Amino acid sequence: MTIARDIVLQESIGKGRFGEVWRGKWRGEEVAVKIFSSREERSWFREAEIYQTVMLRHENILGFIAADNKDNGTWTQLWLVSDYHEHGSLFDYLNRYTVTVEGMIKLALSTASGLAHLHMEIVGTQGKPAIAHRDLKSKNILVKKNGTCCIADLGLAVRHDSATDTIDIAPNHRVGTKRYMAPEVLDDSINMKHFESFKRADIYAMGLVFWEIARRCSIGGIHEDYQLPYYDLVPSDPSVEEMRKVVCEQKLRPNIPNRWQSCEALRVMAKIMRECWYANGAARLTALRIKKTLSQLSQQEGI
């Protein structure tokens, strides 16, 4: 099996909420290593616990390898090892490149497939609880070499037991990225005693990610430049109050350009976005419904 002792760190590649991400080499293979200090044990353990959930593995969820410790002789580092994806985040990918219609659908479908897998409860002996992400954003999705996505940063996730109707942790309010917070999270009206609330807040965030991808879809050399959702309405590093005034009070959502109505795939994406963006979480599409719509679209396009 893969163990920390056999891994050599090569390059710093990112900073998580807590813990730094490194590219490393293990038995002639590149891996990603997230490193936490001893004082970040609760965060490291929670992430190891989520990643070790029964039946979690899916092509659109970051592939977990091992939770380990490494003692350098002075202090102990807590490690989480996972698959390495050279392209980095969907945010990085979208800033660097434009995508074709086929490219856009692959990114959106793979994101929705990963989310539907997290959200779905799988019954049976090797059963999987339903899981809500709570920090979905383009900076937390990684892009693979084949042009498909995988959801990363599962540290803030919440897991549900449907039989006893319980959540595995006592969740704190407004934990994620402010820019991507659902309206009910921004105005703290979210009912955190009902698990469906967390899945519905993830859907809103996915609609924002879909908008980021669609902007980069190039047809006849025509596309928009890269932007974060609400780039036109809030400052860089927005506060909860700044987001709340825009999303809850003024009821604004990222702008849907005119050029998206001319393309069938762009019309389907724009419709999904609007149906992720209702203020009431119960009115939103489910990740399963979105996966089904994008699967039919990919089939008709011959992707």
PDB file of C-alpha atoms in Angstrom:
ATOM      1  CA  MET A   1       0.000   0.000   0.000  1.00  0.00           C
ATOM      2  CA  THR A   2       0.997   3.706  -0.376  1.00  0.00           C
ATOM      3  CA  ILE A   3       2.554   5.098   2.884  1.00  0.00           C
ATOM      4  CA  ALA A   4       4.027   8.558   3.790  1.00  0.00           C
ATOM      5  CA  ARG A   5       7.602   7.202   4.381  1.00  0.00           C
ATOM      6  CA  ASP A   6       7.858   6.285   0.658  1.00  0.00           C
ATOM      7  CA  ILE A   7       6.738   9.694  -0.675  1.00  0.00           C
ATOM      8  CA  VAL A   8       9.120  12.522  -1.615  1.00  0.00           C
ATOM      9  CA  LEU A   9       7.621  16.063  -1.839  1.00  0.00           C
ATOM     10  CA  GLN A  10       8.617  17.954  -4.994  1.00  0.00           C
ATOM     11  CA  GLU A  11       6.586  21.167  -5.401  1.00  0.00           C
ATOM     12  CA  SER A  12       4.071  23.285  -3.417  1.00  0.00           C
ATOM     13  CA  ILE A  13       0.799  23.375  -5.423  1.00  0.00           C
ATOM     14  CA  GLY A  14      -1.851  24.921  -3.192  1.00  0.00           C
ATOM     15  CA  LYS A  15      -3.051  26.171   0.161  1.00  0.00           C
ATOM     16  CA  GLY A  16      -6.210  24.604   1.640  1.00  0.00           C
ATOM     17  CA  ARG A  17      -8.401  26.076   4.450  1.00  0.00           C
ATOM     18  CA  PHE A  18      -5.844  24.423   6.774  1.00  0.00           C
ATOM     19  CA  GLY A  19      -2.980  22.403   5.421  1.00  0.00           C
ATOM     20  CA  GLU A  20      -0.836  22.851   2.343  1.00  0.00           C
ATOM     21  CA  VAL A  21      -0.998  20.793  -0.844  1.00  0.00           C
ATOM     22  CA  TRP A  22       2.191  19.392  -2.403  1.00  0.00           C
ATOM     23  CA  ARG A  23       2.994  17.375  -5.549  1.00  0.00           C
ATOM     24  CA  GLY A  24       5.072  14.328  -4.512  1.00  0.00           C
ATOM     25  CA  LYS A  25       6.516  11.115  -5.983  1.00  0.00           C
ATOM     26  CA  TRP A  26       5.580   7.619  -4.751  1.00  0.00           C
ATOM     27  CA  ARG A  27       7.054   4.453  -6.378  1.00  0.00           C
ATOM     28  CA  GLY A  28       7.596   6.157  -9.723  1.00  0.00           C
ATOM     29  CA  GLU A  29       4.177   7.941  -9.749  1.00  0.00           C
ATOM     30  CA  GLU A  30       3.066  11.547  -9.057  1.00  0.00           C
ATOM     31  CA  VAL A  31       0.587  11.952  -6.100  1.00  0.00           C
ATOM     32  CA  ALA A  32      -0.863  15.000  -4.289  1.00  0.00           C
ATOM     33  CA  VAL A  33      -0.218  15.321  -0.533  1.00  0.00           C
ATOM     34  CA  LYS A  34      -2.206  17.635   1.791  1.00  0.00           C
ATOM     35  CA  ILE A  35      -0.171  18.352   4.961  1.00  0.00           C
ATOM     36  CA  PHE A  36      -1.547  19.439   8.327  1.00  0.00           C
ATOM     37  CA  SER A  37       0.257  20.304  11.588  1.00  0.00           C
ATOM     38  CA  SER A  38      -0.472  18.432  14.907  1.00  0.00           C
ATOM     39  CA  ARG A  39      -2.718  21.312  16.001  1.00  0.00           C
ATOM     40  CA  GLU A  40      -4.895  20.778  12.834  1.00  0.00           C
ATOM     41  CA  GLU A  41      -5.626  17.090  13.813  1.00  0.00           C
ATOM     42  CA  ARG A  42      -9.446  17.644  13.984  1.00  0.00           C
ATOM     43  CA  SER A  43      -9.477  18.974  10.349  1.00  0.00           C
ATOM     44  CA  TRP A  44      -7.153  16.205   9.050  1.00  0.00           C
ATOM     45  CA  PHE A  45      -9.196  13.487  10.799  1.00  0.00           C
ATOM     46  CA  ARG A  46     -12.545  14.847   9.537  1.00  0.00           C
ATOM     47  CA  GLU A  47     -11.225  14.883   5.930  1.00  0.00           C
ATOM     48  CA  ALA A  48      -9.722  11.318   6.330  1.00  0.00           C
ATOM     49  CA  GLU A  49     -13.170  10.206   7.701  1.00  0.00           C
ATOM     50  CA  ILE A  50     -15.103  11.671   4.727  1.00  0.00           C
ATOM     51  CA  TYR A  51     -12.628  10.274   2.173  1.00  0.00           C
ATOM     52  CA  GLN A  52     -12.845   6.780   3.719  1.00  0.00           C
ATOM     53  CA  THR A  53     -16.696   6.677   3.453  1.00  0.00           C
ATOM     54  CA  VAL A  54     -17.896   3.279   2.173  1.00  0.00           C
ATOM     55  CA  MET A  55     -18.642   3.246  -1.611  1.00  0.00           C
ATOM     56  CA  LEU A  56     -17.474   6.919  -2.046  1.00  0.00           C
ATOM     57  CA  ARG A  57     -15.227   6.268  -5.085  1.00  0.00           C
ATOM     58  CA  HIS A  58     -16.466   7.617  -8.408  1.00  0.00           C
ATOM     59  CA  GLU A  59     -14.658   8.900 -11.501  1.00  0.00           C
ATOM     60  CA  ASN A  60     -15.868  12.465 -10.732  1.00  0.00           C
ATOM     61  CA  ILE A  61     -14.781  12.517  -7.009  1.00  0.00           C
ATOM     62  CA  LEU A  62     -11.075  13.012  -6.147  1.00  0.00           C
ATOM     63  CA  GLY A  63      -9.463   9.583  -5.663  1.00  0.00           C
ATOM     64  CA  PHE A  64      -8.290   9.149  -2.068  1.00  0.00           C
ATOM     65  CA  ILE A  65      -5.085   7.129  -1.469  1.00  0.00           C
ATOM     66  CA  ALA A  66      -4.176   7.244   2.274  1.00  0.00           C
ATOM     67  CA  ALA A  67      -4.258   9.129   5.585  1.00  0.00           C
ATOM     68  CA  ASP A  68      -0.856   8.783   7.294  1.00  0.00           C
ATOM     69  CA  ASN A  69       1.595  10.467   9.707  1.00  0.00           C
ATOM     70  CA  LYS A  70       5.247  11.409   9.017  1.00  0.00           C
ATOM     71  CA  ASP A  71       7.720  12.114  11.835  1.00  0.00           C
ATOM     72  CA  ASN A  72      10.780  14.096  10.666  1.00  0.00           C
ATOM     73  CA  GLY A  73      12.526  13.695  14.049  1.00  0.00           C
ATOM     74  CA  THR A  74      11.317  17.036  15.460  1.00  0.00           C
ATOM     75  CA  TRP A  75       7.592  17.199  14.684  1.00  0.00           C
ATOM     76  CA  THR A  76       4.853  15.043  13.174  1.00  0.00           C
ATOM     77  CA  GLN A  77       3.032  16.016   9.979  1.00  0.00           C
ATOM     78  CA  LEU A  78      -0.466  14.644   9.295  1.00  0.00           C
ATOM     79  CA  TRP A  79      -0.870  13.625   5.637  1.00  0.00           C
ATOM     80  CA  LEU A  80      -3.795  13.020   3.230  1.00  0.00           C
ATOM     81  CA  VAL A  81      -2.585  11.517  -0.054  1.00  0.00           C
ATOM     82  CA  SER A  82      -4.753  11.586  -3.219  1.00  0.00           C
ATOM     83  CA  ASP A  83      -4.530  11.340  -7.034  1.00  0.00           C
ATOM     84  CA  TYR A  84      -2.600  14.164  -8.687  1.00  0.00           C
ATOM     85  CA  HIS A  85      -4.286  16.164 -11.549  1.00  0.00           C
ATOM     86  CA  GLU A  86      -1.738  18.277 -13.508  1.00  0.00           C
ATOM     87  CA  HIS A  87      -4.364  20.786 -14.815  1.00  0.00           C
ATOM     88  CA  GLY A  88      -5.224  21.881 -11.278  1.00  0.00           C
ATOM     89  CA  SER A  89      -8.588  23.459 -10.604  1.00  0.00           C
ATOM     90  CA  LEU A  90     -11.487  24.148 -12.943  1.00  0.00           C
ATOM     91  CA  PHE A  91     -10.846  27.854 -12.000  1.00  0.00           C
ATOM     92  CA  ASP A  92      -7.214  27.511 -13.312  1.00  0.00           C
ATOM     93  CA  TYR A  93      -8.348  25.584 -16.382  1.00  0.00           C
ATOM     94  CA  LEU A  94     -11.075  28.161 -17.299  1.00  0.00           C
ATOM     95  CA  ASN A  95      -8.647  31.069 -16.841  1.00  0.00           C
ATOM     96  CA  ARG A  96      -6.131  29.432 -19.217  1.00  0.00           C
ATOM     97  CA  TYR A  97      -8.420  27.977 -21.882  1.00  0.00           C
ATOM     98  CA  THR A  98     -11.650  28.270 -23.808  1.00  0.00           C
ATOM     99  CA  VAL A  99     -13.714  25.138 -24.413  1.00  0.00           C
ATOM    100  CA  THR A 100     -15.763  23.746 -27.317  1.00  0.00           C
ATOM    101  CA  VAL A 101     -19.506  22.839 -26.917  1.00  0.00           C
ATOM    102  CA  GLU A 102     -18.312  19.205 -26.437  1.00  0.00           C
ATOM    103  CA  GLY A 103     -15.717  20.448 -23.880  1.00  0.00           C
ATOM    104  CA  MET A 104     -18.308  22.454 -21.891  1.00  0.00           C
ATOM    105  CA  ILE A 105     -20.795  19.507 -21.726  1.00  0.00           C
ATOM    106  CA  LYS A 106     -18.061  17.100 -20.531  1.00  0.00           C
ATOM    107  CA  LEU A 107     -17.090  19.540 -17.696  1.00  0.00           C
ATOM    108  CA  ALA A 108     -20.712  20.212 -16.667  1.00  0.00           C
ATOM    109  CA  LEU A 109     -21.845  16.588 -16.908  1.00  0.00           C
ATOM    110  CA  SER A 110     -18.826  15.246 -15.002  1.00  0.00           C
ATOM    111  CA  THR A 111     -19.402  17.911 -12.248  1.00  0.00           C
ATOM    112  CA  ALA A 112     -23.147  16.970 -11.940  1.00  0.00           C
ATOM    113  CA  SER A 113     -22.299  13.165 -12.013  1.00  0.00           C
ATOM    114  CA  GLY A 114     -19.830  13.656  -9.127  1.00  0.00           C
ATOM    115  CA  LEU A 115     -22.327  15.735  -7.183  1.00  0.00           C
ATOM    116  CA  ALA A 116     -25.189  13.215  -7.798  1.00  0.00           C
ATOM    117  CA  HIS A 117     -22.910  10.434  -6.456  1.00  0.00           C
ATOM    118  CA  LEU A 118     -22.063  12.444  -3.270  1.00  0.00           C
ATOM    119  CA  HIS A 119     -25.755  13.345  -2.730  1.00  0.00           C
ATOM    120  CA  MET A 120     -27.131   9.810  -3.389  1.00  0.00           C
ATOM    121  CA  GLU A 121     -27.640   7.328  -0.578  1.00  0.00           C
ATOM    122  CA  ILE A 122     -26.672   3.775  -1.755  1.00  0.00           C
ATOM    123  CA  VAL A 123     -28.551   1.107   0.241  1.00  0.00           C
ATOM    124  CA  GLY A 124     -27.199  -2.375   1.130  1.00  0.00           C
ATOM    125  CA  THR A 125     -24.427  -3.982   3.258  1.00  0.00           C
ATOM    126  CA  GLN A 126     -21.741  -1.802   1.679  1.00  0.00           C
ATOM    127  CA  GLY A 127     -24.090   1.162   1.888  1.00  0.00           C
ATOM    128  CA  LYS A 128     -23.160   4.776   1.278  1.00  0.00           C
ATOM    129  CA  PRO A 129     -24.730   7.666   3.266  1.00  0.00           C
ATOM    130  CA  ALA A 130     -25.925  10.793   1.411  1.00  0.00           C
ATOM    131  CA  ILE A 131     -23.170  13.499   1.522  1.00  0.00           C
ATOM    132  CA  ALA A 132     -23.446  17.300   1.035  1.00  0.00           C
ATOM    133  CA  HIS A 133     -20.216  19.226   0.056  1.00  0.00           C
ATOM    134  CA  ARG A 134     -20.896  22.719   1.647  1.00  0.00           C
ATOM    135  CA  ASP A 135     -17.964  24.353  -0.319  1.00  0.00           C
ATOM    136  CA  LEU A 136     -18.590  23.704  -3.992  1.00  0.00           C
ATOM    137  CA  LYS A 137     -16.836  26.207  -6.301  1.00  0.00           C
ATOM    138  CA  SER A 138     -14.667  26.164  -9.429  1.00  0.00           C
ATOM    139  CA  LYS A 139     -11.494  26.427  -7.260  1.00  0.00           C
ATOM    140  CA  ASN A 140     -12.544  23.090  -5.551  1.00  0.00           C
ATOM    141  CA  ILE A 141     -13.097  21.056  -8.685  1.00  0.00           C
ATOM    142  CA  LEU A 142     -10.054  19.558 -10.399  1.00  0.00           C
ATOM    143  CA  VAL A 143      -9.723  18.937 -14.140  1.00  0.00           C
ATOM    144  CA  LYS A 144      -8.372  15.608 -15.366  1.00  0.00           C
ATOM    145  CA  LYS A 145      -6.271  14.981 -18.527  1.00  0.00           C
ATOM    146  CA  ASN A 146      -9.308  13.507 -20.331  1.00  0.00           C
ATOM    147  CA  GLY A 147     -11.179  16.833 -19.912  1.00  0.00           C
ATOM    148  CA  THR A 148     -13.563  15.626 -17.171  1.00  0.00           C
ATOM    149  CA  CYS A 149     -13.903  17.073 -13.610  1.00  0.00           C
ATOM    150  CA  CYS A 150     -13.563  15.609 -10.155  1.00  0.00           C
ATOM    151  CA  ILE A 151     -14.857  17.225  -7.004  1.00  0.00           C
ATOM    152  CA  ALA A 152     -12.142  17.874  -4.407  1.00  0.00           C
ATOM    153  CA  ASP A 153     -11.923  19.471  -0.866  1.00  0.00           C
ATOM    154  CA  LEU A 154     -14.441  17.267   0.967  1.00  0.00           C
ATOM    155  CA  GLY A 155     -13.270  18.549   4.411  1.00  0.00           C
ATOM    156  CA  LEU A 156     -16.447  20.549   5.163  1.00  0.00           C
ATOM    157  CA  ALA A 157     -18.839  17.768   4.027  1.00  0.00           C
ATOM    158  CA  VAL A 158     -21.842  16.544   6.126  1.00  0.00           C
ATOM    159  CA  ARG A 159     -23.118  12.913   6.026  1.00  0.00           C
ATOM    160  CA  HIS A 160     -26.691  11.751   6.556  1.00  0.00           C
ATOM    161  CA  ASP A 161     -28.276   8.575   8.000  1.00  0.00           C
ATOM    162  CA  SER A 162     -31.814   8.393   6.444  1.00  0.00           C
ATOM    163  CA  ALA A 163     -33.082   5.585   8.795  1.00  0.00           C
ATOM    164  CA  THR A 164     -32.525   7.681  12.006  1.00  0.00           C
ATOM    165  CA  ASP A 165     -32.795  11.034  10.036  1.00  0.00           C
ATOM    166  CA  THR A 166     -29.517  12.317  11.569  1.00  0.00           C
ATOM    167  CA  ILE A 167     -26.417  14.286  10.345  1.00  0.00           C
ATOM    168  CA  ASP A 168     -22.959  13.016  11.558  1.00  0.00           C
ATOM    169  CA  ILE A 169     -21.727  16.452  12.828  1.00  0.00           C
ATOM    170  CA  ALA A 170     -23.258  19.599  14.455  1.00  0.00           C
ATOM    171  CA  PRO A 171     -22.788  22.081  11.562  1.00  0.00           C
ATOM    172  CA  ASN A 172     -21.551  25.653  11.995  1.00  0.00           C
ATOM    173  CA  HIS A 173     -23.236  28.479  10.031  1.00  0.00           C
ATOM    174  CA  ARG A 174     -21.777  30.013   6.844  1.00  0.00           C
ATOM    175  CA  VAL A 175     -18.718  27.655   6.567  1.00  0.00           C
ATOM    176  CA  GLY A 176     -17.931  27.911   2.824  1.00  0.00           C
ATOM    177  CA  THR A 177     -16.838  30.517   0.296  1.00  0.00           C
ATOM    178  CA  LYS A 178     -18.961  33.689   0.660  1.00  0.00           C
ATOM    179  CA  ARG A 179     -19.235  34.357  -3.110  1.00  0.00           C
ATOM    180  CA  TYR A 180     -20.896  30.921  -3.686  1.00  0.00           C
ATOM    181  CA  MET A 181     -23.166  30.921  -0.588  1.00  0.00           C
ATOM    182  CA  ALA A 182     -26.822  30.146  -1.343  1.00  0.00           C
ATOM    183  CA  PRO A 183     -29.360  32.892  -0.454  1.00  0.00           C
ATOM    184  CA  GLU A 184     -30.669  30.859   2.570  1.00  0.00           C
ATOM    185  CA  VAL A 185     -27.032  30.524   3.804  1.00  0.00           C
ATOM    186  CA  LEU A 186     -26.400  34.267   3.277  1.00  0.00           C
ATOM    187  CA  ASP A 187     -29.518  35.291   5.239  1.00  0.00           C
ATOM    188  CA  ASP A 188     -29.070  32.349   7.760  1.00  0.00           C
ATOM    189  CA  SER A 189     -32.699  31.150   7.185  1.00  0.00           C
ATOM    190  CA  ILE A 190     -31.363  27.653   6.131  1.00  0.00           C
ATOM    191  CA  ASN A 191     -32.889  24.881   8.307  1.00  0.00           C
ATOM    192  CA  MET A 192     -29.745  23.005   9.373  1.00  0.00           C
ATOM    193  CA  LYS A 193     -31.820  20.230  11.060  1.00  0.00           C
ATOM    194  CA  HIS A 194     -32.950  19.033   7.574  1.00  0.00           C
ATOM    195  CA  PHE A 195     -30.226  17.406   5.433  1.00  0.00           C
ATOM    196  CA  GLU A 196     -32.042  18.241   2.160  1.00  0.00           C
ATOM    197  CA  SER A 197     -31.133  21.934   2.933  1.00  0.00           C
ATOM    198  CA  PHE A 198     -27.410  21.184   2.443  1.00  0.00           C
ATOM    199  CA  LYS A 199     -27.927  19.320  -0.850  1.00  0.00           C
ATOM    200  CA  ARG A 200     -30.089  22.220  -2.162  1.00  0.00           C
ATOM    201  CA  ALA A 201     -27.375  24.800  -1.192  1.00  0.00           C
ATOM    202  CA  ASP A 202     -24.799  22.700  -3.191  1.00  0.00           C
ATOM    203  CA  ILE A 203     -27.106  22.913  -6.253  1.00  0.00           C
ATOM    204  CA  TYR A 204     -27.114  26.723  -6.196  1.00  0.00           C
ATOM    205  CA  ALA A 205     -23.255  26.715  -6.113  1.00  0.00           C
ATOM    206  CA  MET A 206     -23.122  24.245  -9.028  1.00  0.00           C
ATOM    207  CA  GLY A 207     -25.318  26.594 -11.114  1.00  0.00           C
ATOM    208  CA  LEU A 208     -22.709  29.352 -10.510  1.00  0.00           C
ATOM    209  CA  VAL A 209     -19.940  26.961 -11.611  1.00  0.00           C
ATOM    210  CA  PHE A 210     -21.987  26.105 -14.770  1.00  0.00           C
ATOM    211  CA  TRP A 211     -22.158  29.842 -15.566  1.00  0.00           C
ATOM    212  CA  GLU A 212     -18.305  30.050 -15.278  1.00  0.00           C
ATOM    213  CA  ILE A 213     -17.877  27.146 -17.763  1.00  0.00           C
ATOM    214  CA  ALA A 214     -20.538  28.476 -20.245  1.00  0.00           C
ATOM    215  CA  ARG A 215     -18.724  31.891 -20.423  1.00  0.00           C
ATOM    216  CA  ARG A 216     -15.646  30.043 -21.755  1.00  0.00           C
ATOM    217  CA  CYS A 217     -17.579  28.047 -24.434  1.00  0.00           C
ATOM    218  CA  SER A 218     -16.175  29.193 -27.833  1.00  0.00           C
ATOM    219  CA  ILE A 219     -18.451  28.920 -30.926  1.00  0.00           C
ATOM    220  CA  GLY A 220     -17.041  30.453 -34.134  1.00  0.00           C
ATOM    221  CA  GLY A 221     -14.223  31.952 -32.049  1.00  0.00           C
ATOM    222  CA  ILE A 222     -16.822  33.894 -29.942  1.00  0.00           C
ATOM    223  CA  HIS A 223     -16.759  33.531 -26.093  1.00  0.00           C
ATOM    224  CA  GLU A 224     -16.665  35.744 -22.941  1.00  0.00           C
ATOM    225  CA  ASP A 225     -13.489  36.376 -20.882  1.00  0.00           C
ATOM    226  CA  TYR A 226     -13.048  34.411 -17.596  1.00  0.00           C
ATOM    227  CA  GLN A 227     -14.932  35.809 -14.555  1.00  0.00           C
ATOM    228  CA  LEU A 228     -16.028  34.654 -11.067  1.00  0.00           C
ATOM    229  CA  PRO A 229     -19.837  34.809 -10.476  1.00  0.00           C
ATOM    230  CA  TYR A 230     -20.875  38.333  -9.255  1.00  0.00           C
ATOM    231  CA  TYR A 231     -17.576  39.886 -10.563  1.00  0.00           C
ATOM    232  CA  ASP A 232     -19.794  42.803 -11.796  1.00  0.00           C
ATOM    233  CA  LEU A 233     -21.526  43.352  -8.421  1.00  0.00           C
ATOM    234  CA  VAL A 234     -19.265  42.637  -5.475  1.00  0.00           C
ATOM    235  CA  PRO A 235     -15.578  43.393  -4.701  1.00  0.00           C
ATOM    236  CA  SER A 236     -12.767  40.811  -4.710  1.00  0.00           C
ATOM    237  CA  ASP A 237     -12.976  38.948  -1.368  1.00  0.00           C
ATOM    238  CA  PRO A 238     -16.645  39.938  -0.679  1.00  0.00           C
ATOM    239  CA  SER A 239     -18.187  39.954   2.787  1.00  0.00           C
ATOM    240  CA  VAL A 240     -21.426  38.070   3.741  1.00  0.00           C
ATOM    241  CA  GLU A 241     -23.285  41.451   3.906  1.00  0.00           C
ATOM    242  CA  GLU A 242     -22.059  42.519   0.428  1.00  0.00           C
ATOM    243  CA  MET A 243     -23.227  39.135  -1.019  1.00  0.00           C
ATOM    244  CA  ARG A 244     -26.542  39.248   0.936  1.00  0.00           C
ATOM    245  CA  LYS A 245     -27.473  42.729  -0.425  1.00  0.00           C
ATOM    246  CA  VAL A 246     -26.912  41.467  -4.012  1.00  0.00           C
ATOM    247  CA  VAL A 247     -28.287  37.885  -3.859  1.00  0.00           C
ATOM    248  CA  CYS A 248     -31.064  38.221  -1.238  1.00  0.00           C
ATOM    249  CA  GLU A 249     -32.220  41.833  -1.379  1.00  0.00           C
ATOM    250  CA  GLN A 250     -31.627  43.013  -4.933  1.00  0.00           C
ATOM    251  CA  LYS A 251     -32.279  39.352  -6.073  1.00  0.00           C
ATOM    252  CA  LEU A 252     -29.587  39.468  -8.752  1.00  0.00           C
ATOM    253  CA  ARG A 253     -27.898  36.428 -10.302  1.00  0.00           C
ATOM    254  CA  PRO A 254     -24.972  36.214 -12.789  1.00  0.00           C
ATOM    255  CA  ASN A 255     -25.970  37.625 -16.215  1.00  0.00           C
ATOM    256  CA  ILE A 256     -27.050  35.237 -18.992  1.00  0.00           C
ATOM    257  CA  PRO A 257     -25.634  36.679 -22.310  1.00  0.00           C
ATOM    258  CA  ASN A 258     -27.730  36.983 -25.501  1.00  0.00           C
ATOM    259  CA  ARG A 259     -25.333  34.770 -27.536  1.00  0.00           C
ATOM    260  CA  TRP A 260     -26.340  31.700 -25.344  1.00  0.00           C
ATOM    261  CA  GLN A 261     -29.885  31.649 -26.852  1.00  0.00           C
ATOM    262  CA  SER A 262     -28.479  30.887 -30.381  1.00  0.00           C
ATOM    263  CA  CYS A 263     -26.850  27.538 -29.371  1.00  0.00           C
ATOM    264  CA  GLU A 264     -28.971  24.534 -28.191  1.00  0.00           C
ATOM    265  CA  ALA A 265     -26.326  23.300 -25.653  1.00  0.00           C
ATOM    266  CA  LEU A 266     -25.981  26.888 -24.312  1.00  0.00           C
ATOM    267  CA  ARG A 267     -29.824  27.169 -24.053  1.00  0.00           C
ATOM    268  CA  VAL A 268     -29.954  23.926 -22.027  1.00  0.00           C
ATOM    269  CA  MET A 269     -27.060  25.157 -19.734  1.00  0.00           C
ATOM    270  CA  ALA A 270     -28.760  28.619 -19.196  1.00  0.00           C
ATOM    271  CA  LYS A 271     -32.084  26.872 -18.307  1.00  0.00           C
ATOM    272  CA  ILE A 272     -30.264  24.569 -15.761  1.00  0.00           C
ATOM    273  CA  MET A 273     -28.555  27.682 -14.228  1.00  0.00           C
ATOM    274  CA  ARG A 274     -31.896  29.534 -13.679  1.00  0.00           C
ATOM    275  CA  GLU A 275     -33.390  26.353 -12.113  1.00  0.00           C
ATOM    276  CA  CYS A 276     -30.388  26.148  -9.674  1.00  0.00           C
ATOM    277  CA  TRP A 277     -30.786  29.833  -8.709  1.00  0.00           C
ATOM    278  CA  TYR A 278     -34.278  30.088  -7.137  1.00  0.00           C
ATOM    279  CA  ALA A 279     -34.155  31.720  -3.645  1.00  0.00           C
ATOM    280  CA  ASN A 280     -36.182  28.764  -2.250  1.00  0.00           C
ATOM    281  CA  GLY A 281     -33.968  25.676  -2.089  1.00  0.00           C
ATOM    282  CA  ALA A 282     -37.015  23.336  -2.493  1.00  0.00           C
ATOM    283  CA  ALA A 283     -37.714  24.794  -5.985  1.00  0.00           C
ATOM    284  CA  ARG A 284     -34.209  23.863  -7.292  1.00  0.00           C
ATOM    285  CA  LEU A 285     -33.345  20.934  -9.596  1.00  0.00           C
ATOM    286  CA  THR A 286     -31.621  17.892  -7.958  1.00  0.00           C
ATOM    287  CA  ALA A 287     -28.074  16.859  -9.067  1.00  0.00           C
ATOM    288  CA  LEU A 288     -29.646  13.603 -10.425  1.00  0.00           C
ATOM    289  CA  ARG A 289     -32.101  15.499 -12.645  1.00  0.00           C
ATOM    290  CA  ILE A 290     -29.221  17.715 -13.977  1.00  0.00           C
ATOM    291  CA  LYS A 291     -27.047  14.632 -14.675  1.00  0.00           C
ATOM    292  CA  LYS A 292     -29.996  13.100 -16.648  1.00  0.00           C
ATOM    293  CA  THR A 293     -30.531  16.337 -18.701  1.00  0.00           C
ATOM    294  CA  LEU A 294     -26.800  16.677 -19.519  1.00  0.00           C
ATOM    295  CA  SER A 295     -26.479  12.944 -20.330  1.00  0.00           C
ATOM    296  CA  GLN A 296     -29.321  13.240 -22.940  1.00  0.00           C
ATOM    297  CA  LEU A 297     -27.681  16.446 -24.298  1.00  0.00           C
ATOM    298  CA  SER A 298     -24.207  14.706 -24.595  1.00  0.00           C
ATOM    299  CA  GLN A 299     -25.909  11.757 -26.406  1.00  0.00           C
ATOM    300  CA  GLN A 300     -27.659  14.023 -28.995  1.00  0.00           C
ATOM    301  CA  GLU A 301     -24.374  15.970 -29.624  1.00  0.00           C
ATOM    302  CA  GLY A 302     -22.406  12.682 -30.059  1.00  0.00           C
ATOM    303  CA  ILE A 303     -19.750  13.794 -27.505  1.00  0.00           C
TER     304      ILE A 303
END
